[PDB]
């Protein structure tokens, strides 16, 4: 699957940044896992991840610093507690988990600059 996310996003003074992650085509699924990853010099580390279903469209409830609502084939993501040093490349990974077939796609990454 194709995954679209913005090239560049400016975080707030409060350390908050929002950006959408959208995939296509909108294959049948009942379980979508969205993982946010940070690229750090060869290593990809997990920032936060959740699983969206038809009844649970509001995700990352178990994270203080990550929020996300899912609709159509689009997650609107919000990362909090960003610092200047947290400037970097944030990749949206999308997985269609059930039922078969499995699909996986990886966004190009959103560069996040922190004011």
């Amino acid at each position, epitope marked *: 699957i194709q995954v679209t996310q913005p090239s560049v996003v400016l975080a707030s003074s409060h350390g908050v940044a929002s950006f959408p992650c959208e995939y296509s085509p909108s294959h049948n699924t009942d379980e979508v896992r969205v993982t946010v990853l940070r690229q750090t010099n060869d290593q990809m580390t997990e920032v936060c991840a959740t699983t969206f*279903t038809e009844k649970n469209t509001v995700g990352f409830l178990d994270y203080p610093f990550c929020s996300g609502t899912f609709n159509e084939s689009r997650v609107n993501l919000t990362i909090q507690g960003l610092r200047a040093v947290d400037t970097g490349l944030y990749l949206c990974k999308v997985e269609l988990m059930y039922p078969p077939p499995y699909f996986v796609g990886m966004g190009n990454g959103t560069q996040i600059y922190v004011i």
Partner: nanobody, 112 residues
Framework: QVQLVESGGGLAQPGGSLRLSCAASGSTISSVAVGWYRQTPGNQREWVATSSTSSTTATYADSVKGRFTISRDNAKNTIYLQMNSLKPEDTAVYYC??????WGRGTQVTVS
């Protein structure tokens, strides 16, 4: 955005066949995996099968594997579920779906 319309439902005898249709309007489903689900009285909609895509083959639940077949008709922007060797327990309302929540209106299938 895609509106899905089921048809072909009705009554069949045990051992009989029905061909269900999921016709899409709005945009094309030529490239979208389309799922089929069935709902018995008092239960949740349950996955039955998903159509092929450019990169994947059709998939089936083991309860219908070998009896049911999904085929495409791009020109009619439609997916077909061929239902052979029907059983009374195949009785249900059948829905097609794309994405997470884009359900059709469902069509009743009754096997005596």
């Amino acid at each position: 955005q895609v509106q899905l319309v089921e048809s072909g439902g009705g009554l069949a005898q045990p051992g009989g066949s029905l061909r269900l249709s999921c016709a899409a309007s709005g945009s094309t489903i030529s490239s979208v995996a389309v799922g089929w689900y069935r709902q018995t009285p008092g239960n949740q909609r349950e996955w039955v099968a998903t159509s092929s895509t450019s990169s994947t083959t059709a998939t089936y639940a083991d309860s219908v594997k070998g009896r049911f077949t999904i085929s495409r008709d791009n020109a009619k922007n439609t997916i077909y579920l061929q239902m052979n060797s029907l059983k009374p327990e195949d009785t249900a309302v059948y829905y097609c779906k794309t994405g997470l929540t884009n359900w059709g209106r469902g069509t009743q299938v009754t096997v005596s």
